[PDB]
Design a binder for this molecule. Sequence first.
Ligand SMILES: [Ca+2]
Ligand SMILES: [Ca+2]
Ligand SMILES: [Ca+2]
Ligand SMILES: [Ca+2]
Ligand SMILES: [Ca+2]
Ligand SMILES: [Ca+2]
Ligand SMILES: [Ca+2]
Ligand SMILES: [Ca+2]
Lengths: 248, 244
Amino acid sequence: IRMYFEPGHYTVMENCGEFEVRVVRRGDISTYASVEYETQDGTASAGTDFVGRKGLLSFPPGVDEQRFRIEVIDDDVFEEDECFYIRLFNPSEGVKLAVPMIATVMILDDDHAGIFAFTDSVFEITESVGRFELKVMRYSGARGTVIVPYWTENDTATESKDYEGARGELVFENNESEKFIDLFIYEKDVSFKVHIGEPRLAPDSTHYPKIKEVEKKPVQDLTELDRILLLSKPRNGELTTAYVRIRE
Amino acid sequence: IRMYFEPGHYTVMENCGEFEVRVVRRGDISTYASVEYETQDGTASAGTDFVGRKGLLSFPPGVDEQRFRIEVIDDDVFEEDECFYIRLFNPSEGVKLAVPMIATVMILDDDHAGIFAFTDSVFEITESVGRFELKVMRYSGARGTVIVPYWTENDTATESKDYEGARGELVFENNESEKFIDLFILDVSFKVHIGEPRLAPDSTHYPKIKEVEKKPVQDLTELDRILLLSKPRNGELTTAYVRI
Ligand SMILES: [Ca+2]
Ligand SMILES: [Ca+2]
Ligand SMILES: [Ca+2]
Ligand SMILES: [Ca+2]
Ligand SMILES: [Ca+2]
Ligand SMILES: [Ca+2]
Ligand SMILES: [Ca+2]
Ligand SMILES: [Ca+2]
């Protein structure tokens, strides 16, 4: 009877090259069917973010579905989440066209810095451990080399009594995305804070020279391309402060 | 026996004004029991985003739970989302504290412009049925007036053959999420697009904007960064597709 698309959308990182897409025939199927497709551009275009492709889908007697990898074009550049479209057409004389014969394909980037934070905003532990590896997690990207100031604080707890006054800076290299602050430390429960400061790209990140040279230009005089470069750079997140509770 | 927050986690629209926080008694409810708490600063602050409260709850023998209100400060300025913190203390001897004895609280800024985008990347439309109400959403915010360019594109469906003209711009006033684009029809398909959202030369923060937009990004302080972000944008879908 008809012949369509299943699944409907495809969400895919820019960094996996080959990726499959799945076509479907329906109703009766005893005969040799067929249909064709074309990779139409969106905010992703053949040549820049995916390599445009056209082809022919043959559904011999018996088979009722077809597959085919499409390719995504990797790069070191920071962009945003774009779409390109694939479109069905020319179904042979038996088979008609049903929903959906146009497929939406999102390309998630990964060349962003980007966002830095803690797991929870309160952590527990006794007081006979006696070091706690607090994790600062890197999300949404790993691109570049980034510093991550950090420091502790007293609350129900005081340095050199409940814990050890700890201060420093975490250095997230390129493709790394989790670092651990090292934290050294009958009833009695107290707690101290611990913050992560303003993430900053480091001089060696292969994009750092470029960035502080644009910040020369007034907001006003920024291209789209230039505008986005500035959207790439790293930042904290919802959890820039944590708490560490110490019972016994 | 023990006391804690429940929920130990709260989310809030900065425009709500207030909301209730909740504590709880576990062991022996047959006795009177007290407890304190005090708001303490996080990403937020007790004069730009809400009000400060250290206070006193009473758990008369019989009640095993308590509730109180915290007030959110509303404003015009777009900020990012900000977890602030409430924490209990000074329990009555009988009782001990427990998790979550630190309620974390987030403030959801309502002051973005905000983010526009079609509802779907493909819309289906039946044979002989006239007009369709296409929607442009405005997620994340709706702070001030935003102008929204649209139009139409010849495809397999041709303008003035399958569909037609349709080209203008939508003016989302202040507190408005959605506005429609209008499409006029008579196997194939055409796509519709939205453009590059722009504020209006009157939206209270606009001189204030193109003023700072004069600065070298460099000398752009910190609140200039955040102010800046608040300007309207497009979400995921900026092309629709109409199937006939
Ligand atoms: Ca692109
Ligand atoms: Ca891309
Ligand atoms: Ca990449
Ligand atoms: Ca990219
Ligand atoms: Ca604030
Ligand atoms: Ca606020
Ligand atoms: Ca507000
Ligand atoms: Ca606000």
